[PDB]
Amino acid sequence: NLYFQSMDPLLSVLMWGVNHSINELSHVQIPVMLMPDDFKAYSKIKVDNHLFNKENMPSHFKFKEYCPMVFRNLRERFGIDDQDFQNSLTRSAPLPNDGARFHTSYDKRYIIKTITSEDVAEMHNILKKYHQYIVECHGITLLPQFLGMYRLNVDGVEIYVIVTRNVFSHRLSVYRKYDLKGSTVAREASDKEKAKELPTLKDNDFINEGQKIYIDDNNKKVFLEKLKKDVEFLAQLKLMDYSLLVGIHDVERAEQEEVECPLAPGEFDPNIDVYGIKCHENSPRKEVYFMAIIDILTHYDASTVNPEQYSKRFLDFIGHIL
Template identity: 25%
Template sequence: MVESLSRCVKWDASGGKSGSAFLKTLDDRFIAKELSRAELQAMETFAPAYFDYMSSAVTANRPTLLAKIFGCFKISFKKTHKEKSSRTKMTQMNLLVMENLFYDQQFSKIYDLKGSTRNRHVHVTGRINEVLLDENLIQTAHLAPFYLREHSKRIIRGALYNDSKFLADLNVMDYSLVVGVDSEKNELVVGIVDYIRTYTWDKKLESWVKDSAFLANRGEPTIVSPKQYRLRFLDAMERYFPIVPDRWMKHHDAPEEEINGVSDLWI
């Protein structure tokens, strides 16, 4: 891990709006995200609960979609200003190191899904590793839905239920389910990311304003409470990933071979 982190490059993580700096190791195994002061303070409470939860998941052989966190680190370095009187300034950066969900993978499409349709659409350009959002998926789902086999559906449903309950109990919201689509193998690689953000007083105020009569006709609120966010998230993911029709569901004249695009799940 140390060897990997010693060789990092700046990474333009499309899809995110936090403004945080991202680094990716040259071997593509780890991602490091710069933490704000508020996020670092939140980690003091979140980290012990997170590692307890992940440890219990391993012990009980319980699937989880939470992208694995390896720790928080503070980096200090000196920056020298090129002036007549050379001055040296100490700079610090707090980093969250986590796994790269898409290590050693090639995808035809990547989605960042929050279960909301408010401002969740991007113009498709066809760029490599372009990140699409909820509305992009909804627009194409009637032609190419993400059908899952019964076993995969059961795993993702259970993992989403447990993970989202864990996050809601810790007052966490605004997380995303990232989905990588491997069209050649008919596989989906999925994981929950951005689950450090807590429901602070400023988010409560924004939620109250959005829910007020003054903005009542402008669609669903951007910010909701963690419990509301969880319910909306679970409901959307249930619709986004339908179970594959079996011989009891499909038309009696359709041969079994006609069911295409069935995806296996990797978490």
């Protein structure tokens, strides 16, 4: 059984919070359809414990859930169950990915990012248009799949968090990771980042390392048509500084690393790992790719490029690197 214990009190509050909210929604009717009031809605909870549960939890904290009805529906349109989502985020504490802190849920299905009050304001202004977009494309997008948005407050420390579906497989390990923008300018990983176990390589590192993505002509078309649809929507919203995260799973490298210690190697459930693409039969090395648009909440309002320029330069860059 769960006690939501952590060295980090913010994670304890986050774990209690997701548990609380998912339970609260089991006592709230599924609406026929979402209404405009849901898109400016929230739930606030202030807990003050005195000489009670001092060992497992902080005694004084707050937890705010933004637009609870919209996010329960977004979760459902992405094929996630509320009980599964709850267990993934509470059965065991989320791990840090070593400012803009990133945490992965213990089962590697969800990602938790610490965001600013501006991102939360931007999230609210794009929420109606974002929800309708997810409706019109039947949840089939390269865009981030936002599943919850919370405000945490413990020990006089206030943080905002957004939960997304991982880009990378919950099961298959990623040996190479790229953050791609293109256009402007000397985007390259530093010698310091290059020293990490899994560095975040960038645009020039993709070209200079001689990186190729061996997907068949059909998948390449299906992907680039999906990318244009999503990147066109992004420019309408006046968003920018977004990138395409690329993760590569190396099958025969994953096999040798597991020989040291009903799915075959190089196989994944696309109902779980939604961003996965198999390599084609003529690939020099059996790999699996995981690609999606990441980091979308930077508005134009707050020499330089505009969102139309940003969108074309980006699509051109991905289409040329395939």
